[PDB]
From a paper:
The MERS-CoV ORF4b protein is a viral accessory protein that functions as an innate immune inhibitor and strongly localizes to the nucleus, despite virus replication occurring exclusively within the cytoplasmic compartment. The MERS-CoV ORF4b protein has been shown to bind preferentially to the nuclear import adapter IMPα3 in infected cells, thereby inhibiting NF-κB-dependent innate immune responses. Here we provide a detailed, structural basis for the interaction between MERS-CoV ORF4b and its innate immune suppression target, the nuclear import adapter IMPα. Our results provide a detailed structural basis that explains how a virus can target the IMPα nuclear import adapter to impair immunity, and illustrate how small mutations in ORF4b, like those found in closely related coronaviruses such as HKU5, change the IMPα binding mechanism.
Since structural data of the binding site of NF-κB on IMPα remains elusive, we tested whether these sites overlapped. We crystallized the well-characterized NLS of p5026 in complex with both IMPα2 and IMPα3, and found that it bound at the major site of both IMPα2 and IMPα3 through highly similar interactions involving p50 residues 361RKRQKM in which Lys362 bound at the P2 site. HB number of hydrogen bonds, SB number of salt bridges, NHB number of non-hydrogen bonds generated in PDBsum, BSA  buried surface area calculated in PISA. B Crystal structure of NF-ĸB p50 ORF4b NLS bound to IMPα3 at 2.15 Å resolution. Overall, there was clear overlap in the binding sites of MERS-CoV ORF4b and NF-κB on both IMPα2 and IMPα3. Our crystal structures confirm that the binding site for the NLS region of p50 is located within the major site of IMPα, overlapping directly with the high-affinity P0 Arg binding site of ORF4b. Structural analysis of the NF-κB component p50 bound to IMPα2 and IMPα3 demonstrates that there is a direct overlap between the binding sites for this host transcription factor component and its competitive ORF4b inhibitor.
Residue numbers in the entry:
A (entry chain B): 361 to 368
B (entry chain A): 72 to 487
Amino acid sequence: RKRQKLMP
Amino acid sequence: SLEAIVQNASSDNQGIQLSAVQAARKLLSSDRNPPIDDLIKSGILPILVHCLERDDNPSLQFEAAWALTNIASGTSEQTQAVVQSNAVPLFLRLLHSPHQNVCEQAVWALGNIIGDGPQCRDYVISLGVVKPLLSFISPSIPITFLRNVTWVMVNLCRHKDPPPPMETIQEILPALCVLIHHTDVNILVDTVWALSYLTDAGNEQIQMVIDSGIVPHLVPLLSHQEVKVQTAALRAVGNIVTGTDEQTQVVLNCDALSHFPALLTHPKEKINKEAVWFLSNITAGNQQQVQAVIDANLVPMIIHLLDKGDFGTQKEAAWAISNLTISGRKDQVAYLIQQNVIPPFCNLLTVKDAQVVQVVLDGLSNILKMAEDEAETIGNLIEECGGLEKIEQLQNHENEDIYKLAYEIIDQFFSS
C-alpha cells in the first residue's frame, strides 16, 4: 500500500 | 544535528533553507529503515508543509514533498502525523503544478496517505483528488508516472469498510476502461487489482463494473502470459461470478470457460484453487450454466483436482461438486457419477476441517436423493471406496450437523 521513495 | 536542520529549514536565506530540506530528505531516503520518528519529533513537518507552497522554487517543493512522502510511508501514526500537519490540501494544490516532477511527488505522497485507511482515503476524496489524479492519464505521460497514478488508484479502491463512495467508483471506472487496453504489465496488474477490489464490495459495485463495459476486456486477461495479470483477472471474474446468475451469465457470455483448461492445469496451485473456486460459483447457478461447465469438458479436471490436489483446491472442488446438486438435473449428476466422482469425493470425509466434511456429506446425501432409481448402485459405489466406514465413524464426531447427517444418511440409504 505504501511506498518509500529511495534515492535511485 | 536535527535541531540545526529544522532551524535552517526555517531560514529566509534560500540556500540555507534548501540545504536543510535536502539534508532531511536524504536522511529519509537513503535506507529502507529511515528515522521517521526522530524527524517528526524535531518539529520539521510544518516547515516542509510551508515549503510545499513555494511555487517560485520547484526544487524546494520537490524536496519537501519527497521528505513528506517518505515520512508518510511508515506506520499509520507517522502518516497521520503528516495528515494532521494540513499537508493534504497543499498536495492537492501541487497536483496542478506545471512541473511534472512536482505533480508526481504530490501524487506519490497522496498515494501513501490514501493507503493508510478508508477514513483517510475519504478525507482525501472529499477534497477532490480523483479528478486531477485521473486527468494525468495520457499517451504523453511517462510510464513511471502512469504506474504511480495507477498505484494511487489501487489504493483508492482498496478498503471496503467503508467502500469508496459510489461517485468515486463511477469516476474511476472509465479510467480503468482506458487502462485495461494498456500494454505495460504493471499498469495492467494495477488496473485488474483495482477491478478486483471494486468487485469484492457487493453486487451493486459488481453491476457498476459490468455496466462500464470492461468485462469483455477483463476475461481475455485470464490467458495472459504474465502470471500476475492472470491471478488478478481470475480474482476479479471470480468476484463477479459470486453475484447473481445474470452477472455470472455476462461473465460466461464473455467466453470465460474457454480459458479454464489452462488454469486448472496451471503449475501454480493457487491458480488451480482460484479457478476451481470460480467454477464452484458457476455450478451453484442454473441448469444452463452447469451444462456450460459440462460442455467445456472441465468436470474431469475438477474431479482430478478433488482427488490429487492440495487441500485448498480440494476444498474448492468439493464445494463445486456439492454446488452442482443445487439446481442440477439428474442427467447432470449422472454425468458426475460416470466420471468417478464418488471415490475422491468421499476421501475428504477424514479431513480435520469440519466445513469440508459437512459439504461432502451434503453432496453425498443430495446425490443419493436425486438418483432414486440408481440409489442402490450408488450406495454400493460409496461402500466400495471405503466411504461407508468413514460415514459410520463420523457418527462419533464433535459437530452436531456432522453426526446428524451421518446418522440420517446411514439410516436412509444404508439400511432399507
